[PDB]
């Protein structure tokens, strides 16, 4: 059909190209015009202002830095928001997504919050996924168009903060997982091992994690933090060994001591399951 | 055939039962005799001292607290060590494994270091694995017997510290991965979501991690920490959002700030790839 893309960083440039690849009439906008060059040469239309970019289509795809940058685009484009569906793909907090949705509805438009679980070359893949939250009717109406961004789309609820929350929940896991790999690479280095040497082991470790999360999910939800299969004190001692191995090799112990600190703190409550630390993390 | 198991905590009790299940003539020892009860009732023989436990067989399986506890068992059993293969499965540092091997060889015996990647109910499973390091001839001779402990056995090298290193490399990843899950559970709680609600998402996230580790392994080993697919500054900002989301919900920010701290530190070098922090972690 036809669509608008505002924000042409690597994410938005990949979204526009996926829309052009699918035969969509594409209208664009970016603060730096020289980022739309390749897209314009392919047949995308560059708007001179955000107003013209907005009023060109009912579906408007936003891929800006954050929600704070979004208020700048809309700063004078007020009337073009009415009767339009604004899909905000800028990864920020659930609170900032709720404040963005509230302002858009006030302007007579609808806000869909998106959490894209894809790097830019994954944009348009049938295997990638995006979390969506906000008004169900707008999600349903434009679902086929959001499938252009990622083949899979996952509607979480009416709450604007929901897709943002899911996005953060993902990053809570990803960043430390990758950082634990940077820690593994650094230790294995002081021992003549390369990153590709430990890659199969680390991949296999992450691949088998789901068995543990399912086993633990059932016990947490029931309120069971036993000693049946594991004890926190042994976790503390295992982390002391990880800290010692890294310290012995001259490798930095900042990330492993941070993990040890959470286990040591907790034993001060308790030497039940290593899951018991959750009760110290919750509000 | 016939075998000895010293140390009857849940790990050693599961090892002895796997040996009895396979028709092995089993000789035992533990500091607390009441932990061998069930095993003796099944046909295992309880020794009165470590000396008698050692001299009963050429293959001796050790499952003690650590290497420091091992010197106590051997404290007066000196002569029973000669001509015996001692498999030390006590998870401790590579340095303590090298000091344990050195003492055993001095006593005329051979030390095999083991790193069991299994909880006690996984003991004897064809799907589980154990890392082994030390003299190749002893590993080769007794491989069928070590397959009773875990179906898969992975000989890493002649170095006593090697299997211990591999064991730590595993724990470097496991403990933070599980802790990131405890962090995810805590955040999702302040938002009406259960652990089983987020379990599929977290499992899927870990399952897809191997793609990232393989992509990054090749670039690290070559010395490439570009900006091609990612920038450290965006990682810092993404972690700031994870920290803010948790702080907004009243959830503890200790584990996410520790991750943010490693990214923020690093940008002080550099805003190339988020992999660039490795050069600050190495010796």
Coordinates of C-alpha atoms in Angstrom, one line a residue:
Chain A
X1 CA 0.0 0.0 0.0
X2 CA 1.6 3.3 1.2
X3 CA 3.6 4.2 4.4
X4 CA 5.7 6.9 6.2
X5 CA 9.1 6.3 7.9
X6 CA 10.5 9.1 10.2
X7 CA 14.1 8.7 11.6
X8 CA 16.7 7.3 9.1
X9 CA 19.4 5.8 11.3
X10 CA 20.4 2.2 10.4
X11 CA 17.1 0.9 11.8
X12 CA 14.8 3.3 9.9
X13 CA 16.8 3.0 6.7
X14 CA 16.4 -0.8 6.8
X15 CA 12.6 -0.4 7.5
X16 CA 12.1 1.9 4.5
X17 CA 14.1 -0.4 2.2
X18 CA 11.9 -3.4 3.3
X19 CA 8.8 -1.3 2.6
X20 CA 10.2 -0.3 -0.9
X21 CA 11.1 -4.0 -1.5
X22 CA 7.4 -4.9 -0.9
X23 CA 6.1 -2.3 -3.3
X24 CA 5.1 0.3 -0.7
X25 CA 4.8 3.9 -1.8
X26 CA 7.3 5.3 0.7
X27 CA 7.4 8.9 2.2
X28 CA 10.4 9.8 4.5
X29 CA 11.8 12.4 7.0
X30 CA 15.2 12.8 8.8
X31 CA 17.0 15.7 10.6
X32 CA 20.0 15.0 8.3
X33 CA 18.7 14.8 4.7
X34 CA 21.9 13.1 3.3
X35 CA 20.8 9.9 5.1
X36 CA 17.8 9.5 2.7
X37 CA 20.0 9.7 -0.5
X38 CA 20.1 6.0 -1.3
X39 CA 16.4 5.6 -0.4
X40 CA 15.3 8.6 -2.7
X41 CA 17.4 7.1 -5.6
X42 CA 15.3 3.9 -5.2
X43 CA 12.0 5.8 -5.4
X44 CA 11.3 6.9 -1.8
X45 CA 9.9 10.5 -1.4
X46 CA 11.8 12.8 0.9
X47 CA 9.5 15.3 2.7
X48 CA 10.7 18.9 3.4
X49 CA 9.2 18.8 6.9
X50 CA 7.7 16.3 9.5
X51 CA 4.2 17.8 8.8
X52 CA 4.2 16.7 5.1
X53 CA 5.7 13.3 6.1
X54 CA 2.8 12.8 8.6
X55 CA -0.2 13.9 6.4
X56 CA 1.0 11.7 3.5
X57 CA -0.3 8.5 5.2
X58 CA -2.5 7.0 7.9
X59 CA 0.4 4.7 9.0
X60 CA 3.5 6.5 10.4
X61 CA 6.6 4.5 11.4
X62 CA 8.9 6.3 13.9
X63 CA 12.5 5.1 14.5
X64 CA 14.1 8.0 16.5
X65 CA 16.8 8.0 19.3
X66 CA 14.2 7.9 22.1
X67 CA 10.8 9.3 23.2
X68 CA 12.5 12.7 24.2
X69 CA 13.5 13.1 20.5
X70 CA 9.9 12.4 19.4
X71 CA 8.5 15.6 20.9
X72 CA 10.8 17.6 18.7
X73 CA 9.4 16.1 15.4
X74 CA 5.8 16.8 16.6
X75 CA 6.8 20.4 17.7
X76 CA 4.6 22.3 15.2
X77 CA 3.2 19.3 13.3
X78 CA 0.3 19.2 15.9
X79 CA -2.7 18.9 13.4
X80 CA -1.1 16.2 11.2
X81 CA -1.3 13.8 14.2
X82 CA -5.2 13.6 14.1
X83 CA -6.6 10.3 12.6
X84 CA -3.2 8.8 12.2
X85 CA -1.6 5.6 13.7
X86 CA 1.9 6.4 15.0
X87 CA 4.1 3.3 15.6
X88 CA 6.9 4.3 17.9
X89 CA 9.9 1.9 17.6
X90 CA 12.4 4.0 19.6
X91 CA 13.6 1.7 22.5
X92 CA 13.1 3.6 25.8
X93 CA 11.5 3.0 29.2
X94 CA 7.8 1.9 29.8
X95 CA 7.1 5.3 31.6
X96 CA 8.4 7.4 28.6
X97 CA 6.2 5.2 26.3
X98 CA 3.1 5.9 28.5
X99 CA 3.8 9.6 28.3
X100 CA 4.3 9.5 24.5
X101 CA 1.0 7.5 24.0
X102 CA -0.9 10.0 26.2
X103 CA 0.3 13.1 24.2
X104 CA -0.5 11.3 20.8
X105 CA -4.2 10.4 21.9
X106 CA -4.6 14.1 23.1
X107 CA -3.7 15.1 19.5
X108 CA -6.4 12.7 18.1
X109 CA -4.0 10.0 16.9
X110 CA -3.2 6.5 18.0
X111 CA 0.1 5.3 19.5
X112 CA 1.4 1.8 19.1
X113 CA 4.6 1.0 21.2
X114 CA 7.1 -1.3 19.5
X115 CA 10.1 -3.3 20.8
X116 CA 12.1 -4.6 17.7
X117 CA 14.2 -7.7 18.6
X118 CA 16.3 -7.3 15.5
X119 CA 19.6 -5.7 14.3
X120 CA 19.1 -3.6 11.0
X121 CA 20.0 -6.6 8.5
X122 CA 17.3 -8.7 10.3
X123 CA 14.7 -6.0 9.3
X124 CA 12.1 -7.7 7.0
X125 CA 13.1 -11.3 7.9
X126 CA 10.2 -13.8 8.5
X127 CA 12.0 -15.1 11.5
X128 CA 12.4 -11.9 13.5
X129 CA 10.0 -10.5 16.1
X130 CA 8.6 -7.2 17.5
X131 CA 6.6 -6.7 20.7
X132 CA 3.6 -4.3 20.3
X133 CA 1.4 -2.6 22.9
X134 CA -1.4 0.0 22.8
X135 CA -4.9 0.1 21.2
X136 CA -5.8 -3.4 19.9
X137 CA -7.9 -2.0 16.9
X138 CA -4.9 -0.1 15.4
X139 CA -2.6 -3.1 15.9
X140 CA -5.1 -5.4 14.1
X141 CA -5.7 -2.9 11.2
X142 CA -2.0 -2.4 10.4
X143 CA -0.6 -5.9 11.4
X144 CA 0.3 -6.8 7.7
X145 CA 2.3 -3.6 7.4
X146 CA 4.2 -4.2 10.8
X147 CA 5.0 -7.7 9.4
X148 CA 7.2 -5.8 6.8
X149 CA 9.4 -4.7 9.8
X150 CA 9.7 -8.2 11.3
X151 CA 7.9 -11.4 10.1
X152 CA 6.6 -12.0 13.6
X153 CA 4.7 -9.4 15.7
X154 CA 3.7 -10.0 19.4
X155 CA 0.8 -7.9 20.8
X156 CA 1.3 -7.8 24.6
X157 CA -1.6 -5.6 25.7
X158 CA -3.4 -2.2 25.8
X159 CA -0.8 -0.7 28.1
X160 CA 1.7 1.6 26.2
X161 CA 4.5 0.6 28.6
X162 CA 4.1 -3.2 27.9
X163 CA 6.1 -3.6 24.7
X164 CA 8.8 -1.3 26.2
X165 CA 8.9 -3.5 29.4
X166 CA 9.3 -6.7 27.2
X167 CA 12.0 -4.9 25.3
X168 CA 13.9 -4.1 28.6
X169 CA 13.3 -7.7 29.9
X170 CA 15.1 -8.9 26.8
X171 CA 18.1 -6.4 27.3
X172 CA 18.2 -7.4 31.0
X173 CA 19.3 -10.8 29.8
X174 CA 21.2 -10.0 26.5
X175 CA 23.7 -7.4 27.8
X176 CA 24.9 -9.5 30.8
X177 CA 24.9 -12.7 28.7
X178 CA 27.2 -11.0 26.2
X179 CA 29.3 -9.4 29.0
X180 CA 29.7 -12.9 30.6
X181 CA 31.0 -14.0 27.2
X182 CA 33.4 -11.0 27.1
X183 CA 34.5 -12.2 30.6
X184 CA 35.0 -15.9 29.4
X185 CA 37.0 -14.6 26.3
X186 CA 39.3 -12.6 28.7
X187 CA 39.9 -15.5 31.1
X188 CA 40.4 -18.2 28.4
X189 CA 43.0 -15.7 26.7
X190 CA 45.3 -15.8 29.8
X191 CA 45.3 -19.6 29.1
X192 CA 46.1 -19.9 25.4
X193 CA 42.4 -20.3 24.2
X194 CA 40.7 -18.2 21.5
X195 CA 37.1 -16.9 21.4
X196 CA 36.2 -19.5 18.7
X197 CA 37.7 -22.2 20.9
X198 CA 35.2 -21.5 23.7
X199 CA 32.4 -20.4 21.4
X200 CA 30.9 -24.0 21.1
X201 CA 30.9 -24.4 24.9
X202 CA 29.3 -21.0 25.6
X203 CA 26.6 -21.5 22.9
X204 CA 25.8 -25.0 24.4
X205 CA 25.7 -23.5 27.9
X206 CA 23.1 -20.8 26.7
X207 CA 21.2 -23.4 24.6
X208 CA 20.7 -25.6 27.8
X209 CA 19.7 -22.6 30.0
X210 CA 15.9 -22.9 29.1
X211 CA 15.7 -26.2 31.0
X212 CA 16.8 -24.3 34.2
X213 CA 14.6 -21.3 33.7
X214 CA 11.5 -23.6 33.3
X215 CA 12.4 -25.6 36.4
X216 CA 12.9 -22.4 38.4
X217 CA 9.9 -20.5 37.0
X218 CA 7.5 -23.1 38.5
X219 CA 9.1 -22.9 41.9
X220 CA 9.3 -19.1 42.1
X221 CA 5.6 -18.6 41.0
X222 CA 4.6 -21.1 43.8
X223 CA 6.9 -19.4 46.4
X224 CA 9.3 -22.4 46.7
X225 CA 13.0 -21.4 47.2
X226 CA 14.1 -24.8 48.8
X227 CA 17.5 -26.6 49.1
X228 CA 16.1 -29.8 47.3
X229 CA 18.4 -29.5 44.2
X230 CA 20.6 -26.5 45.2
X231 CA 22.0 -24.4 48.1
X232 CA 22.9 -20.6 47.9
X233 CA 26.1 -21.2 50.0
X234 CA 27.5 -23.5 47.2
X235 CA 26.6 -20.8 44.6
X236 CA 28.5 -18.2 46.7
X237 CA 31.5 -20.7 46.9
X238 CA 31.4 -21.4 43.2
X239 CA 31.4 -17.7 42.4
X240 CA 34.4 -17.2 44.9
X241 CA 36.3 -19.8 42.7
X242 CA 35.3 -17.9 39.4
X243 CA 36.6 -14.6 41.2
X244 CA 39.8 -16.4 42.3
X245 CA 40.5 -18.0 38.8
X246 CA 40.2 -14.6 37.1
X247 CA 42.3 -12.8 39.9
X248 CA 45.0 -15.6 39.6
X249 CA 45.3 -15.0 35.8
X250 CA 45.5 -11.2 36.2
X251 CA 42.1 -10.9 34.5
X252 CA 39.6 -8.2 35.7
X253 CA 37.2 -9.5 38.5
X254 CA 34.6 -6.6 38.3
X255 CA 31.8 -8.5 36.5
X256 CA 32.3 -11.8 38.5
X257 CA 32.5 -10.0 41.9
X258 CA 29.3 -8.1 41.1
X259 CA 27.6 -11.6 40.7
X260 CA 29.4 -12.9 43.8
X261 CA 28.2 -9.8 45.7
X262 CA 24.5 -10.6 44.9
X263 CA 25.0 -14.2 46.2
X264 CA 27.1 -13.3 49.3
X265 CA 24.3 -10.6 50.0
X266 CA 21.4 -13.0 50.3
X267 CA 23.2 -15.6 52.4
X268 CA 22.7 -12.8 55.0
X269 CA 18.9 -13.7 55.0
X270 CA 19.3 -17.2 52.8
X271 CA 21.2 -20.4 52.3
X272 CA 18.1 -22.0 50.8
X273 CA 18.0 -21.9 46.9
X274 CA 20.2 -19.5 44.9
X275 CA 16.7 -18.3 43.6
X276 CA 16.1 -16.8 47.1
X277 CA 17.9 -13.6 46.1
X278 CA 14.8 -12.6 44.0
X279 CA 13.0 -11.6 47.3
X280 CA 15.8 -9.0 47.9
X281 CA 15.5 -7.7 44.3
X282 CA 11.7 -7.1 44.1
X283 CA 10.0 -3.8 45.1
Chain B
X1 CA 34.4 -54.0 37.0
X2 CA 35.3 -52.6 40.5
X3 CA 35.7 -48.9 41.7
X4 CA 36.2 -46.6 44.8
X5 CA 34.1 -43.5 45.6
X6 CA 35.4 -41.1 48.4
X7 CA 33.1 -38.2 49.4
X8 CA 29.4 -39.0 49.8
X9 CA 27.6 -35.6 49.3
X10 CA 24.7 -35.6 46.8
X11 CA 27.3 -35.7 43.9
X12 CA 29.3 -38.7 45.2
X13 CA 26.2 -40.6 46.4
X14 CA 24.7 -40.3 42.8
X15 CA 28.1 -41.5 41.3
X16 CA 28.2 -44.6 43.6
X17 CA 24.5 -45.5 42.7
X18 CA 25.3 -45.2 39.0
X19 CA 28.3 -47.6 39.5
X20 CA 26.2 -50.0 41.5
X21 CA 23.4 -49.8 38.7
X22 CA 26.1 -50.9 36.2
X23 CA 27.2 -53.9 38.2
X24 CA 30.4 -52.3 39.7
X25 CA 31.8 -53.8 42.9
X26 CA 31.7 -50.5 44.9
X27 CA 34.0 -49.5 47.9
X28 CA 33.2 -46.2 49.7
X29 CA 34.5 -43.7 52.3
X30 CA 32.9 -40.5 53.9
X31 CA 33.8 -38.4 57.0
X32 CA 30.1 -38.9 58.1
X33 CA 29.4 -42.7 57.9
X34 CA 25.5 -42.2 58.1
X35 CA 25.7 -40.8 54.5
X36 CA 26.7 -44.3 53.1
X37 CA 23.6 -46.1 54.7
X38 CA 21.4 -46.4 51.6
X39 CA 24.4 -47.3 49.4
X40 CA 25.6 -50.1 51.9
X41 CA 22.0 -51.5 52.0
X42 CA 22.3 -51.8 48.2
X43 CA 25.6 -53.7 48.3
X44 CA 28.3 -51.0 48.5
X45 CA 31.1 -51.7 50.9
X46 CA 31.9 -49.0 53.5
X47 CA 35.6 -48.7 54.4
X48 CA 36.7 -48.0 58.0
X49 CA 39.5 -45.6 56.7
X50 CA 40.6 -43.8 53.5
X51 CA 43.6 -46.2 53.3
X52 CA 41.4 -49.3 52.9
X53 CA 39.1 -47.4 50.5
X54 CA 42.2 -46.5 48.3
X55 CA 44.0 -49.9 48.3
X56 CA 40.7 -51.7 47.3
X57 CA 41.0 -50.5 43.6
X58 CA 43.2 -49.0 40.9
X59 CA 40.4 -46.4 40.0
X60 CA 39.6 -44.0 42.9
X61 CA 36.7 -41.4 42.3
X62 CA 37.0 -38.3 44.6
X63 CA 34.0 -36.0 45.2
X64 CA 35.0 -33.8 48.1
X65 CA 34.3 -30.1 48.9
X66 CA 37.4 -28.7 47.3
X67 CA 41.2 -29.6 46.8
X68 CA 42.0 -28.2 50.4
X69 CA 39.7 -31.0 51.8
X70 CA 41.6 -33.7 49.6
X71 CA 44.9 -33.3 51.6
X72 CA 43.0 -34.4 54.8
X73 CA 41.9 -37.7 53.3
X74 CA 45.5 -38.4 52.1
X75 CA 46.9 -37.3 55.5
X76 CA 48.3 -40.8 56.6
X77 CA 47.1 -42.8 53.5
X78 CA 50.5 -41.9 51.7
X79 CA 51.5 -45.4 50.5
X80 CA 48.0 -46.3 49.2
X81 CA 48.3 -43.6 46.5
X82 CA 51.1 -45.5 44.6
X83 CA 50.0 -47.2 41.3
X84 CA 46.5 -45.7 41.5
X85 CA 44.5 -43.3 39.3
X86 CA 42.8 -40.6 41.3
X87 CA 40.0 -38.8 39.6
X88 CA 39.4 -35.5 41.4
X89 CA 35.9 -34.2 40.7
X90 CA 35.9 -31.4 43.4
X91 CA 35.2 -28.1 41.5
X92 CA 38.0 -25.7 42.5
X93 CA 40.5 -23.3 40.7
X94 CA 43.0 -24.4 38.0
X95 CA 45.9 -23.5 40.4
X96 CA 44.6 -25.7 43.2
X97 CA 44.1 -28.6 40.7
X98 CA 47.8 -28.2 39.5
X99 CA 49.0 -28.3 43.2
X100 CA 46.8 -31.4 43.8
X101 CA 48.2 -33.3 40.7
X102 CA 51.8 -32.5 41.6
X103 CA 51.4 -34.0 45.2
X104 CA 49.6 -37.2 43.8
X105 CA 52.5 -37.8 41.2
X106 CA 55.0 -37.3 44.0
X107 CA 53.2 -40.2 45.8
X108 CA 53.5 -42.4 42.7
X109 CA 49.9 -42.1 41.5
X110 CA 48.1 -40.4 38.6
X111 CA 45.7 -37.4 39.0
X112 CA 42.9 -36.8 36.5
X113 CA 41.1 -33.4 37.0
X114 CA 37.4 -33.5 36.3
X115 CA 34.8 -30.8 35.7
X116 CA 31.2 -32.4 36.0
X117 CA 28.6 -30.3 34.1
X118 CA 25.7 -32.1 35.9
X119 CA 23.5 -31.8 38.9
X120 CA 23.3 -35.1 41.0
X121 CA 20.1 -36.5 39.2
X122 CA 21.9 -36.0 35.8
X123 CA 24.8 -38.4 37.1
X124 CA 24.9 -41.5 34.8
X125 CA 22.9 -39.8 31.9
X126 CA 24.1 -40.4 28.3
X127 CA 23.5 -36.7 27.6
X128 CA 25.7 -35.2 30.3
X129 CA 29.4 -34.2 30.1
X130 CA 32.5 -33.9 32.2
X131 CA 35.8 -32.1 31.2
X132 CA 39.0 -34.1 32.0
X133 CA 42.6 -33.0 32.1
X134 CA 45.9 -34.6 33.1
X135 CA 47.8 -37.7 31.8
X136 CA 46.3 -39.0 28.5
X137 CA 47.2 -42.7 29.2
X138 CA 45.1 -42.8 32.5
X139 CA 42.2 -41.0 30.8
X140 CA 42.2 -43.5 27.9
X141 CA 42.5 -46.6 30.2
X142 CA 39.6 -45.6 32.5
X143 CA 37.3 -43.7 29.9
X144 CA 34.5 -46.5 30.0
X145 CA 34.4 -46.1 33.9
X146 CA 34.2 -42.2 33.7
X147 CA 31.3 -42.7 31.2
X148 CA 29.4 -44.1 34.2
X149 CA 29.6 -40.6 35.8
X150 CA 28.4 -38.8 32.6
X151 CA 27.8 -40.3 29.2
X152 CA 30.0 -37.8 27.5
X153 CA 33.7 -37.1 28.6
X154 CA 35.8 -34.3 27.1
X155 CA 39.6 -34.6 27.5
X156 CA 41.1 -31.1 27.3
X157 CA 44.8 -31.7 27.7
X158 CA 47.8 -32.8 29.8
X159 CA 47.5 -29.7 32.0
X160 CA 45.9 -30.4 35.4
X161 CA 44.4 -26.8 35.5
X162 CA 42.6 -27.3 32.1
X163 CA 39.4 -29.1 33.1
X164 CA 39.1 -26.8 36.1
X165 CA 39.5 -23.7 33.8
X166 CA 36.7 -25.1 31.5
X167 CA 34.6 -25.7 34.6
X168 CA 35.1 -22.0 35.7
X169 CA 34.4 -20.8 32.1
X170 CA 31.1 -22.6 32.3
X171 CA 30.2 -21.0 35.8
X172 CA 31.3 -17.5 34.4
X173 CA 28.4 -17.8 32.1
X174 CA 25.8 -19.8 34.2
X175 CA 25.7 -17.8 37.4
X176 CA 25.2 -14.4 35.7
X177 CA 22.8 -15.9 33.2
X178 CA 20.7 -17.2 36.1
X179 CA 21.1 -14.0 38.0
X180 CA 19.9 -12.0 34.9
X181 CA 16.8 -14.3 35.0
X182 CA 16.4 -13.5 38.7
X183 CA 16.6 -9.8 37.7
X184 CA 14.0 -10.3 34.9
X185 CA 11.6 -12.1 37.3
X186 CA 11.9 -9.2 39.8
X187 CA 11.2 -6.5 37.2
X188 CA 8.3 -8.4 35.5
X189 CA 6.8 -8.9 39.0
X190 CA 6.4 -5.1 39.6
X191 CA 4.3 -5.3 36.3
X192 CA 1.8 -8.2 37.0
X193 CA 3.9 -10.9 35.1
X194 CA 4.9 -14.3 36.5
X195 CA 8.2 -16.2 36.0
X196 CA 6.5 -18.7 33.7
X197 CA 5.0 -15.8 31.7
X198 CA 8.6 -14.6 30.8
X199 CA 10.2 -18.1 30.8
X200 CA 9.5 -18.7 27.0
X201 CA 11.0 -15.3 26.1
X202 CA 14.1 -15.7 28.3
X203 CA 14.7 -19.3 27.0
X204 CA 14.4 -18.1 23.4
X205 CA 16.8 -15.2 24.1
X206 CA 19.4 -17.7 25.5
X207 CA 18.7 -20.1 22.7
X208 CA 19.5 -17.4 20.1
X209 CA 22.7 -16.2 21.9
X210 CA 25.0 -18.7 20.0
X211 CA 24.5 -16.8 16.7
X212 CA 25.9 -13.7 18.5
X213 CA 28.8 -15.5 20.2
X214 CA 29.9 -17.1 16.8
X215 CA 29.6 -13.7 15.0
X216 CA 31.7 -12.0 17.8
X217 CA 34.2 -14.9 18.3
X218 CA 35.6 -14.5 14.7
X219 CA 36.0 -10.7 15.0
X220 CA 37.7 -10.8 18.5
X221 CA 40.2 -13.5 17.3
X222 CA 41.1 -11.3 14.3
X223 CA 41.3 -8.1 16.5
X224 CA 38.3 -6.4 15.0
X225 CA 36.1 -4.3 17.4
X226 CA 34.5 -2.1 14.7
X227 CA 31.2 -0.1 14.6
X228 CA 29.9 -1.9 11.5
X229 CA 26.9 -3.6 13.2
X230 CA 27.1 -2.0 16.7
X231 CA 28.3 0.9 18.8
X232 CA 29.3 0.8 22.5
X233 CA 27.6 4.2 23.2
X234 CA 24.2 2.7 22.2
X235 CA 25.0 -0.3 24.5
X236 CA 25.7 2.2 27.4
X237 CA 22.3 4.0 26.6
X238 CA 20.4 0.7 26.4
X239 CA 21.8 -0.3 29.8
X240 CA 20.9 3.2 31.2
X241 CA 17.2 2.4 30.1
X242 CA 17.4 -1.1 31.8
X243 CA 18.7 0.7 35.0
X244 CA 15.9 3.3 34.7
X245 CA 13.1 0.8 34.2
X246 CA 14.1 -1.2 37.3
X247 CA 14.6 2.0 39.3
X248 CA 11.2 3.3 38.2
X249 CA 9.5 0.0 39.4
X250 CA 11.2 0.1 42.8
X251 CA 13.2 -3.0 41.7
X252 CA 16.9 -3.3 42.8
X253 CA 19.4 -1.9 40.2
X254 CA 22.6 -3.5 41.6
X255 CA 23.1 -6.2 38.8
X256 CA 22.1 -3.9 35.9
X257 CA 24.3 -1.0 37.1
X258 CA 27.3 -3.5 37.4
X259 CA 26.7 -4.3 33.6
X260 CA 26.2 -0.5 32.8
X261 CA 29.4 0.3 34.8
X262 CA 31.4 -2.0 32.5
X263 CA 29.9 -0.3 29.3
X264 CA 30.3 3.3 30.7
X265 CA 33.9 2.3 31.7
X266 CA 35.2 1.4 28.2
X267 CA 33.5 4.4 26.5
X268 CA 36.4 6.1 28.3
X269 CA 38.8 4.4 25.8
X270 CA 35.9 3.1 23.2
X271 CA 32.7 3.9 21.3
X272 CA 33.7 1.2 18.7
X273 CA 32.0 -2.2 19.3
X274 CA 30.6 -3.2 22.7
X275 CA 33.1 -6.1 22.4
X276 CA 35.9 -3.4 22.9
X277 CA 35.6 -3.8 26.7
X278 CA 37.5 -7.2 26.4
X279 CA 40.8 -5.2 26.0
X280 CA 40.1 -3.7 29.5
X281 CA 39.3 -7.2 31.1
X282 CA 42.4 -9.1 29.8
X283 CA 45.7 -9.4 31.8

